[PDB]
Amino acid sequence: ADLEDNMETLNDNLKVIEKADNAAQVKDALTKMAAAAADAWSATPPKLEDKSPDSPEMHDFRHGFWILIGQIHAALHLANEGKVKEAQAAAEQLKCTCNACHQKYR
Amino acid sequence: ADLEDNMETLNDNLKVIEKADNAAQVKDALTKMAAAAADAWSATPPKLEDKSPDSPEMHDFRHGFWILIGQIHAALHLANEGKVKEAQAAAEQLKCTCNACHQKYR
Amino acid sequence: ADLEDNMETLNDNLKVIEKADNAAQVKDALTKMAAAAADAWSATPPKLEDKSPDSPEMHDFRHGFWILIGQIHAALHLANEGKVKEAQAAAEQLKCTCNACHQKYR
Ligand code: HEC
Ligand code: HEC
Ligand code: HEC
Ligand SMILES: [Cl-]
Ligand SMILES: [Cl-]
Ligand SMILES: [Cl-]
Ligand code: NI
Ligand code: NI
Ligand code: NI
Ligand code: NI
Ligand code: NI
Numbered sequence: 121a122d123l124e125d126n127m128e129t130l131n132d133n134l135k136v137i138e139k140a141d142n143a144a145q146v147k148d149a150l151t152k153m154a155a156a157a158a159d160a161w162s163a164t165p166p167k168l169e170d171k172s173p174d175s176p177e178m179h180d181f182r183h184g185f186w187i188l189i190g191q192i193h194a195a196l197h198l199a200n201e202g203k204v205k206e207a208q209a210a211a212e213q214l215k216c217t218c219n220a221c222h223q224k225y226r
Numbered sequence: 227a228d229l230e231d232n233m234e235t236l237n238d239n240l241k242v243i244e245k246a247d248n249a250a251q252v253k254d255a256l257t258k259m260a261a262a263a264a265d266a267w268s269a270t271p272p273k274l275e276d277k278s279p280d281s282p283e284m285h286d287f288r289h290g291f292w293i294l295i296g297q298i299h300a301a302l303h304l305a306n307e308g309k310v311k312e313a314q315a316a317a318e319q320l321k322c323t324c325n326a327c328h329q330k331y332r
Numbered sequence: 333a334d335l336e337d338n339m340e341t342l343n344d345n346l347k348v349i350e351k352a353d354n355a356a357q358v359k360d361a362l363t364k365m366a367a368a369a370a371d372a373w374s375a376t377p378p379k380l381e382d383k384s385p386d387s388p389e390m391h392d393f394r395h396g397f398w399i400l401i402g403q404i405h406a407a408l409h410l411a412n413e414g415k416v417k418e419a420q421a422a423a424e425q426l427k428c429t430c431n432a433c434h435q436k437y438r
Pocket of ligand 5: 227228229230269270
């Protein structure tokens, strides 16, 4: 999928996590976020279209998805342990990573 | 172990995963793959032997193992949940990463 | 927290893991290490204070925390399976990563 579609999936499922009651719901949403983030990681964003694929900016963009995916994985571990509110809090804190990448590259 | 020996371990255990019936077998193979990939990550491949250790090519080579290890870890999570066929499908899709690194650096 | 405080947390909890009897104790310590390492990852160490934030040295410093966090996560998986002595051995081997970063940047 393209970058915007993956971002819609990330955005939608963050809201699913916020409204969830139980860990199964949180885990299903995190799994979809993980897939969307993995697919977005291969994108070239509009503001970097000319940069060399070996450029520091493209490498940093990809590192942003590594951070997001790592945090999603941590939230998934919490969900697997049934720590719903802790998983929801980790997902809430993902937003810092979304915003940081957006400030540089969106 | 050297790079070729770790690649043999990766290759052999990918076939173990393909032929497996149950998650214990898949998990044992993925664990061996994770160890081989972690050990290969420190290798300098023949086609990069002269490049500076701080070079973009050596950094990219190592990022290739980060990708592989991340995907192995995801397959391991699926195996831990008893999703044998989903774990086998994730392992099958690892091959895209093996091939991509081979195209650049083997 | 600052870098030194996060390093104290890493150091203290490595000793907790060494003295632990059971996986709950090991897991609690690894969780604190993961949080300290994630927080240290954003630090600029004294010996790199002038370097550009886009510099290879700052990027390599951050990759050192990626390695540490990955190894902590592997030890946590072992602890989750109740493999206390294997988790303790993985944590013992973390020290190679602590030392390698210290040799370059401390
Ligand atoms: C590492 C980079 C990065 C991360 C992390 C990231 N984004 Fe984005 N996001 C972008 C870029 C680049 C765009 C602009 C896409 C475009 O203009 O085509 C974007 C666009 C969007 C959009 C607008 C989509 C549209 O229809 O135009 C939304 C919503 C969004 N992001 C939400 C999120 C959420 C939620 C997260 C995390 C949970 C997130 N983003 C994490 C890079 C990132
Ligand atoms: C990030 C880099 C990278 C990844 C990922 C990677 N390889 Fe390799 N692989 C290499 C390189 C480099 C060589 C060449 C080694 C040499 O010539 O000494 C190689 C060689 C091999 C060989 C030949 C071994 C021999 O005896 O000569 C096999 C088989 C192999 N890889 C299989 C795999 C499989 C299976 C995977 C994933 C499951 C994989 N590789 C992933 C870099 C990689
Ligand atoms: C990727 C880099 C990196 C890793 C990994 C790392 N350290 Fe450090 N560590 C540093 C740096 C840089 C300093 C120096 C901090 C300063 O001088 O302010 C330091 C300082 C320390 C100190 C001295 C703290 C003090 O009070 O002055 C201790 C103890 C320590 N590290 C232990 C550890 C342990 C234990 C680990 C792993 C389990 C570890 N470090 C992993 C970079 C790292
Ligand atoms: Cl795209
Ligand atoms: Cl080698
Ligand atoms: Cl600091
Ligand atoms: Ni896509
Ligand atoms: Ni070796
Ligand atoms: Ni990098
Ligand atoms: Ni801090
Ligand atoms: Ni995990």
